[PDB]
Amino acid sequence: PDYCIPNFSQTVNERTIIDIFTICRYRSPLVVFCLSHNELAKKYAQDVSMSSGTHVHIIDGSVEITVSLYRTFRTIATQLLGRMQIVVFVTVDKSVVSTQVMKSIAWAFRGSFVELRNQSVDSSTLVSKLENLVSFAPLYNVPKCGPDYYGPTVYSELLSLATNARTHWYATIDYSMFTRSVLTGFVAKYFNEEAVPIDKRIVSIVGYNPPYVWTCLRHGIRPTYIEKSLPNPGGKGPFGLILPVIHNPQIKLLCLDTFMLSTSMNILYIGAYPATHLLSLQLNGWTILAFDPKITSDWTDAMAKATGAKVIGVSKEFDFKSFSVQANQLNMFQNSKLSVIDDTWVETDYEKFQSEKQAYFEWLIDRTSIDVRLISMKWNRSKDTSVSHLLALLPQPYGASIREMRAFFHKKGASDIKILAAETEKYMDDFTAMSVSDQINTQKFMHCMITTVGDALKMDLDGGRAVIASYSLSNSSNSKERVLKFLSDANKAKAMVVFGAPNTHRLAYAKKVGLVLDSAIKMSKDLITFSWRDYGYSQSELYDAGYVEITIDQMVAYSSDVYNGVGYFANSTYNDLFSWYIPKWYVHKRMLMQDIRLSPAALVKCFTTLIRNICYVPHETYYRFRGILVDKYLRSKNVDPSQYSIVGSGSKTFTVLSHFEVPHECGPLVFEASTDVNISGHLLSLAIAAHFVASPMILWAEQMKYMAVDRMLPPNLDKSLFFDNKVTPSGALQRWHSREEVLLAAEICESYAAMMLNNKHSPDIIGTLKSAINLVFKI
Amino acid sequence: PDYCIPNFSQTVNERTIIDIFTICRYRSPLVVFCLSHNELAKKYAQDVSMSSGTHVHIIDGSVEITVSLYRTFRTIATQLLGRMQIVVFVTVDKSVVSTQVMKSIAWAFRGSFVELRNQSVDSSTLVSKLENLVSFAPLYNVPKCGPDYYGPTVYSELLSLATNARTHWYATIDYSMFTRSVLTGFVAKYFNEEAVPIDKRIVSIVGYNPPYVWTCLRHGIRPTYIEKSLPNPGGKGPFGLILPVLLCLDTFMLSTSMNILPATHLLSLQLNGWTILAFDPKITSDWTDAMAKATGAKVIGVSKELNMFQNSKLSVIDLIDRTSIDVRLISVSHLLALLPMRAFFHKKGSVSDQINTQKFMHCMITTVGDALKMDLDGGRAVIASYSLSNSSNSKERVLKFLSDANKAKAMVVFGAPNTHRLAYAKKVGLVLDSAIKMSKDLITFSWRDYGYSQSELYDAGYVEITIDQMVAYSSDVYNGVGYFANSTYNDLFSWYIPKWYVHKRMLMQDIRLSPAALVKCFTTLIRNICYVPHETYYRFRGILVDKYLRSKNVDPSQYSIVGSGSKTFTVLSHFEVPHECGPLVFEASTDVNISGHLLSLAIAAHFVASPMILWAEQMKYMAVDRMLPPNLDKSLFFDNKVTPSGALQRWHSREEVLLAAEICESYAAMMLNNKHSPDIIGTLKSAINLVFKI
Ligand SMILES: C[S@@+](CC[C@H](N)C(=O)[O-])C[C@H]1O[C@@H](n2cnc3c(N)ncnc32)[C@H](O)[C@@H]1O
Ligand SMILES: C[S@@+](CC[C@H](N)C(=O)[O-])C[C@H]1O[C@@H](n2cnc3c(N)ncnc32)[C@H](O)[C@@H]1O
Ligand SMILES: C[S@@+](CC[C@H](N)C(=O)[O-])C[C@H]1O[C@@H](n2cnc3c(N)ncnc32)[C@H](O)[C@@H]1O
């Protein structure tokens, strides 16, 4: 035993398990890099491989694209826990594999994606991104699963002695920001797929969570928050927002502008030039009337092209003394909602300028042909003044010791109020004397204006409503019985409530083996204390409530063609303790056909391969072990050994000699004489994967149940998205497995995990997965 | 607590050091597989990579052979601690790269070697060995660093339901048998290179150790044992070996005379210089041919039912004191031994415990005495494998004996526990006090040995060489076994050869003596774990040199830190740094590029035996260009630049080497989060300073 291979006994103990958790932080090694020059690709493949040992592939068209993708990514699926970078160069034309398809493939394997085909061989951008492969390996400065990144990590700093060749690295914070981005992108994908009208692209965020304003505007979605908590800001005015108690480029401007854009689809942007930060936003459905004397027709046409909003650029000064909804082209907004962003400034007579603007806005806010929702104005007043319709006067959260505030006019604002320039000087002087992280938190004063107070469990779920209930509904103030009822009702209403919660049994597994010390995180039954209390949730109870787990990887791959969020660089053990869930109705409507975006390809081989390498398990021996596990299961069911013959190969688990049946919750497992049984091996490795990271067992199981028979490919999907599965001559995705082959795998799953993890598995993880698989396959 | 990358502070603790020890058991993932059929190779490369993630290369000849080998094995060098199998297919013919060159490269990278290049596309041997690749991956059933294996592991039992698809696995026992076999093969290479006459190919095994008889006869060498403790076995006879309390006997008999009076077992031995007179009636003309060419012996088959030997000595295998023939041994008057039956005539005359009776046969080829006082004349070959390190021999006397063996140009091969490697393994908690205890250099294996260090033995005229280096160096005469797994226990020991032979035959570094398979794989592994980019690594190198020059009060305005792969720094104006080896001279307007492999070999020295001092001797020799040895295949030098003049191009200046040695303690503390061993670094540094003495 000690002196036998395969050896799980000496190789897998609690220290090995901890080491697998550790390796899981490095589980995203892939870069996919597309370019049109094969000799360049061959040079840098040689250079990175020879210096760093990066594993390199070139898809160059010597082999048909479907076959090339299949062999390349079957190989790569087994290596994703090897802690070595992997690069796939794609040098075929976009008409051979589109940008969107290759991006889908890259993100489904958790990779960075670089599209530079049809860049000239002279492109400094192409040469630079290639040299960066050799410079940074085994790291790379293009984020995994998204083009952009706005965290503190600065890759250029790793190449320079100025910071001693080191940069910041906040793995947990960056992956959480990535997670919010993806959840938003998934809602954007849902809106596209369900043909939601542009003016209904609104999501409710359960619990205040500031980054969702930016992520929503990055995808053309308007956020709104629901908070149980009464805000009580402690200022004056009807809402207490007049002086309340106290790393994107141009984040200062993004902070206010994405907030204001959240308040109306029609915007009057006074003094808008150049608003470069807007160009990264998706503003389909918005109308922006921009006034600035520096407006050119080219700025107008670039803003409209970048954002997709209908932009009217007025190259004149806006007239603050013409009190007419027919002046300043305001008539375009009659019978509609309007919000106004005033960023105007002048060196000559700045104080008088504002008194003019103030009087104009006090007039404008109260019009009746336009529903003016919110006006924001630079506020830097020397002389005292009395203000009308003032709802808020707030500091800038990214203002950082600066004179100027931001005044907010509203129809529900303070009718009149005396704003003493001695207190606005004091208030700003205190505010100048605070930390960056304190003052940034004052953005909650802005965001309460787009916050509804109420109990999200009581919200109206009508109309296919989109809701992101990230961590919030799992807080122990919401009882599990009420949340499961809510979610069940949400699925029945065919709403889109996206739900996240700590994963009970994975959190418990991580405690039990000594990863988390039982200090930084602690639990008792399903109640969990983080360092606040949430309830953990598991897949069986949620599947009963009509919810199916999907991983974050699957969500961003599925949404790849609308995604406009951030990527990430490292995985994070903390984030991996959570699971995310979507309603069953949407899975069955749109996700039963498993193209690579919804595949668990990047999970089903990498853990098994790592364990076989550690434990000296030969390829064919693995399949022998599987047949032996089946043998012991059938024996334990008093099946007569005479009726079957174990084969134990990749293509045949066993052969049925004579007819027999095994009693099973879902109805007996029927084995007909003289048939070959090939059990569903991916169920077994997904059960191992579920010990360490979110593992999409039930999404795969629903897909697997659907693939009891052949299914025609969907007509509006590039067929290369199906490269990883057999497609019949007729164009049907070929069937996968019978119910017996899947439920048999579920029946031996406990003994498999015990074998592969030296009885140091979690029987609780297995049982909740087994139970939910039986639910998928119920009579 | 740090939120920065690179990160050693949260990533490298004592448990990380333990895991690296564990990964070193998997450090031989390579298989080198030669065949003539490229579409064949492409098919099985796809099969094994797609199913098990094996990394596959195909050297097919679309790129010139020297370049292909260089690119392939520079890549592989970085990957040897990845715990994933690596397969290199070679499909060019033997006139592009020979069997012997490819075998030498394979074993220099701790690989399995398969040569099937002239088999046809559906040869069943070829097709089977290719499917074995898919079936067994990540393992493979052809041993590493040797064609044969005779341990308890049986690979077919992995594919059998009846045995529960498991087999025996005795890593330390198998690596010890591999080690004995390689030491023997190295003595065989040494006899070859020294043109030692065939009648003089005799090795003294210090300490009784049974497998050496078979390994010696596998290489045409006769063994003799030297033992200090050998008390009476309790028999009647002047040797006391009568009644004391197949391949085996013949190899023992063959040890006792170059003239000897089916025998299918004898076919695998090497018996050049032996003359066999064979008695049986079954003898056919072909069998004598087969025996002669297989074993290289002069054999005559009588085909029936004796003064070739009037000049010589003779032994006979089933009267004695003739004056014409000196009958050495025959297998009652003049009887020497009767053992478990079988009789032995001499002028001067439970199943596990039955095998240990071979101790009674080997007594007759055993000389009693203290090996520390033996005669060292003649370039005598001696294998002091795990014997002279025993604490009964004192360190002063052993180091004296080794010192004098080197002066005398003897070939005494010495092995000993590595003090500071062992101490490190215990300090981080790998080796438990239960198993091995240590007080200074005295070690208790739970017998007691003294540990030795590399500086000690270099002071005594000895140079460490690794097992991997010995078997690769000896690849063209090797006839021993390979291994399947590495073993922590075996890695705790270091092996040393005398300085005189190193300087005479080992200063020219072809791949067989390269540290290629150690200089990148630890570094690459640590960079992966600790998030160290490729360029950043050379930035860190620049920082360490800068901190060092400042600690020596070098004026920083006299140099510019570059921190790249090709320039560590540039000298702006002349300066000099005092050093025990003579000042380090830095001239204006030149570029300095320190020898980074010193730093990586010091890291490797924490975990496994080190080729550091052999590398340093070669590095010293390579201060200038050196013409290639005329009778070596050119491709063996693929890993180093060769001049148009036909010379191996010079490597580094003494400044570049000693600067590396000077920053070596700071490099190891950086890469191991201060969890390194200052003593390992210290013994390597003082040794390197001795290699480069004034
Ligand atoms: C965004 S995190 C806040 C974490 C931190 N411990 C705190 O309270 O500020 C969870 C938020 O969601 C809110 N939340 C939880 N359940 C809710 C529900 N059923 N309806 C509305 N808000 C809810 C909580 O009040 C909390 O503010
Ligand atoms: C603070 S900068 C605006 C920057 C812009 N908000 C952005 O995000 O990049 C001041 C701008 O106000 C404009 N401005 C000043 N008076 C104006 C007026 N009466 N009408 C329109 N624009 C005015 C100037 O042309 C100038 O472009
Ligand atoms: C550490 S033991 C290992 C051999 C064997 N495995 C055993 O258990 O004894 C080394 C052997 O070599 C012998 N030996 C040690 N030093 C010797 C010397 N200087 N001359 C001859 N024999 C020596 C010892 O008597 C001992 O039997």
Q: Which amino acid is at A93?
A: D
Q: Which residues contact A749 (CB under 8 A, 6 or more apart)?
A: A683, A684, A687, A766, A769, A770
Q: Which of B110, B108, B33 is nearest to B640 (CA)?
A: B108
Between the CA of residue A508 and those of A475, A543, B90, what are the distances in Å? Answer: 18, 20, 50
Identify whether A3 is part of a domain.
Answer: no
Helix (H, G, I), strand (E, B) or coil at A371: strand
Do B62 and B142 lie in one domain? The reply is: yes
Query: What is the CB < 6 Å shell around ligand 3?
Result: B 206-207, 226-229, 370-372, 386-388, 390, 393, 447
B5 touches chain A (CB under 8 A): yes
Q: Which of A258, A241, A251, A262 is nearest to A397 (CA)?
A: A251
Do A686 and A578 lie in one domain? The reply is: no
Q: Are B133 and B466 in contact (CB under 8 A)?
A: no
Q: Which residues contact B197 (CB under 8 A, 6 or more apart)?
A: none
- Transcribe B324-347 into DSSP letters: SSEEEEE---SEEEEE--EEEE-T
What is the residue range of A416's domain?
232-449
Between the CA of residue A59 and those of A87, A97, A346, A722, what are the distances in Å? Answer: 11, 10, 57, 17
Strand intervals (E) in B60-133: 86-90, 112-115
Pocket test for ligand 3, best of B179, B205, B227, B448 (most atoms within 8 A of CB): B227
Looking at the partner chain, which of A135, A609, A612 has a beta carbon nearest the beta carbon of B533?
A: A135
Do A660 and A715 lie in one domain? The reply is: yes
Strand intervals (E) in A560-671: 578-583, 644-646, 654-656, 660-662, 669-671
- The minimum-distance atom of ligand 1 relative to the CA of A229 is 25
- Cβ B139–A616 below 8 Å, yes or no? yes
Last residue of a domain, one of A449, A481, A508: A449
DSSP 8-state code for residue B628: P
Cα B389 to middle of ligand 3, angstroms: 9
- Transcribe A732-773 into DSSP letters: EEPP---HHHHHHHHHHHHHHHHHHTTT-S-HHHHHHHHHHH
CA distance B692 to B657: 9
CA distance A356 to B492: 86
Last residue of a domain, one of A397, A431, A449: A449
Cα-based angle A705, A710, A716 (whole degrees, multiple of 5): 100
> Residue written as tokens 């480029």?
A249
How many CB atoms lie under 10 A from the CB of residue B441? 19
Q: How many CA atoms lie within 13 A of B566 on its CB side?
A: 0
Give the long-range contacts of residues A256-259, CB within 8 A, separation 24 or more: A256/A341, A256/A376, A256/A396, A256/A406, A256/A446, A257/A341, A258/A213, A258/A214, A258/A216, A258/A217, A259/A213, A259/A443, A259/A446, A259/A447, A259/A450
Do A463 and A443 lie in one domain? The reply is: no
- Transcribe B393-408 into DSSP letters: S-HHHHHHHHHHHHHT
Q: Which of B369, B74, B324, B126 is nearest to B230 (CA)?
A: B369
Q: Which of A748, A604, A749 is nearest to A689 (CA)?
A: A604
Cα A516 to middle of ligand 2, angstroms: 53
Two tokens, residue A71: 């062999």
CA distance B201 to A472: 82
Cα A319 to middle of ligand 2, angstroms: 13
Q: Are A518 and A576 in contact (CB under 8 A)?
A: no
Cis previous bond, A696, omega within 30: no
Helix (H, G, I), strand (E, B) or coil at A5: strand
CA distance B277 to B299: 6
Two tokens, residue A489: 């009702």
CA distance A761 to A17: 9
Q: Which residues contact B644 (CB under 8 A, 6 or more apart)?
A: none
**Ligand closest to CA A207:** 1
Pairing state of beta strands A466-469 and A496-502? parallel
Q: How many CA atoms lie within 13 A of A245 on its CB side?
A: 4
Do A608 and A532 lie in one domain? The reply is: no
Q: Which of A389, A377, A391 is nearest to A416 (CA)?
A: A389
Put simply, the chain B residues between 305 and 364 with a CB less than 8 A from any chain A CB are none
Compute the CA torsion angle A246, A250, A256, A261 (nearest 10 deg): -160
- Cβ B533–A75 below 8 Å, yes or no? no
Q: Are B187 and B180 in contact (CB under 8 A)?
A: no
Q: Which amino acid is at B104?
A: S
Q: Which residues of A touch B4 (CB under 8 A)?
A: 166-169
- The minimum-distance atom of ligand 1 relative to the CA of A457 is 19
Q: Give me the helix-helix angle, B171-193 and B211-218, nearest 10°.
A: 40
Whether residue A501 has its Cβ less than 6 Å from ligand 2: no
B560 touches chain A (CB under 8 A): no
Computed on alpha carbons and rounded to an integer, the radius of gyration of chain A in Å comes to: 29
- Transcribe A445-476 into DSSP letters: HHHGGGEEES-GGGS---TT-EEEE-SGGGBT
CA distance A630 to A684: 12
CA distance A517 to A134: 38
Q: Which of A500, A497, A499 is nearest to A467 (CA)?
A: A497
> Residue written as tokens 């009970």?
A504
Do B471 and B573 lie in one domain? The reply is: no
- The minimum-distance atom of ligand 3 relative to the CA of B390 is 1
Do A124 and A240 lie in one domain? The reply is: no
Q: Which of A734, A720, A730 is nearest to A64 (CA)?
A: A720
Q: Which amino acid is at A421?
A: A
CA distance A230 to A454: 9
- Cβ B165–A139 below 8 Å, yes or no? no
Do B163 and B25 lie in one domain? The reply is: yes
Whether residue A270 has its Cβ less than 6 Å from ligand 2: yes
Q: Which residues contact A314 (CB under 8 A, 6 or more apart)?
A: A289, A290, A291, A292, A295, A328, A329
- Cβ A166–B139 below 8 Å, yes or no? no
B170 touches chain A (CB under 8 A): yes
Looking at the partner chain, which of A50, A138, A164 has a beta carbon nearest the beta carbon of B74?
A: A50
Residue B501: alpha-carbon gap to chain centroid: 16
Do A139 and A279 lie in one domain? The reply is: no
Letter string b/e over residues A212-244, b meaning 16 or more CB atoms within 10 A of that residue's CB: bbbbbbbbbbbbbbbbeeebebebbbebbbbbb
Q: Is the dihedral of CA B661, B667, B672, B677 positive or negative?
A: positive
Residue A676: alpha-carbon gap to chain centroid: 41
Identify whether A148 is part of a domain.
Answer: yes
Q: How many domains would you assign to chain A?
A: 4
Cα-based angle A424, A429, A433 (whole degrees, multiple of 5): 145
Do B18 and B56 lie in one domain? The reply is: yes
**Ligand closest to CA B393:** 3
Identify whether A6 is part of a domain.
Answer: no
Q: Are A318 and A328 in contact (CB under 8 A)?
A: yes
B64 touches chain A (CB under 8 A): no
Q: How many residues does chain B have?
A: 694
Query: Which of A56, A58, A161 is the best substitution to test chain B (most B C-beta atoms within 10 A)?
Result: A161
* End-to-end C-alpha distance for chain A, whole angstroms: 43
Two tokens, residue B596: 């980074």
Q: Which residues contact B203 (CB under 8 A, 6 or more apart)?
A: B184, B187, B212, B216, B221, B222, B223, B224, B381, B382, B383
Do B529 and B661 lie in one domain? The reply is: yes
CA distance A33 to A115: 6
Q: Are B191 and B381 in contact (CB under 8 A)?
A: yes
Pairing state of beta strands A711-712 and A732-733? antiparallel
Identify whether A5 is part of a domain.
Answer: no
Identify whether A19 is part of a domain.
Answer: yes
Cα-based angle A159, A161, A167 (whole degrees, multiple of 5): 60
Q: Which of A584, A581, A466 is nearest to A220 (CA)?
A: A466
Q: Which of A422, A394, A381 is nearest to A245 (CA)?
A: A394
B165 touches chain A (CB under 8 A): yes
Q: Are B497 and B413 in contact (CB under 8 A)?
A: yes
Q: Is the dihedral of CA B503, B504, B507, B512 positive or negative?
A: negative
Query: Which of A9, A43, A49 is the best substitution to test chain B (most B C-beta atoms within 10 A)?
Result: A49
Q: Which residues contact A3 (CB under 8 A, 6 or more apart)?
A: B168, B169, B170
Q: Which residues contact B39 (CB under 8 A, 6 or more apart)?
A: none
Q: Are B222 and B216 in contact (CB under 8 A)?
A: yes
Q: Which of B615, B593, B596, B592 is nearest to B692 (CA)?
A: B615
Cα A291 to middle of ligand 2, angstroms: 8
CA distance A410 to A365: 6
Identify whether A4 is part of a domain.
Answer: no
Cα B455 to middle of ligand 3, angstroms: 24
Letter string b/e over residues A573-612, b meaning 16 or more CB atoms within 10 A of that residue's CB: bebbbbbbbbbbbbbeeebbbbbbbbbbbbbbbbbbbbbb
Do A151 and A276 lie in one domain? The reply is: no
Last residue of a domain, one of A449, A480, A496: A449
Sheet containing strand A55-59, edge to edge, reads: A55-59, A86-90, A30-34, A112-115
CA distance B375 to B394: 19
How many CB atoms lie under 10 A from the CB of residue A294? 11
- Cβ A52–B78 below 8 Å, yes or no? yes
Q: How many CA atoms lie within 13 A of A268 on its CB side?
A: 31
How many CB atoms lie under 10 A from the CB of residue B437? 15
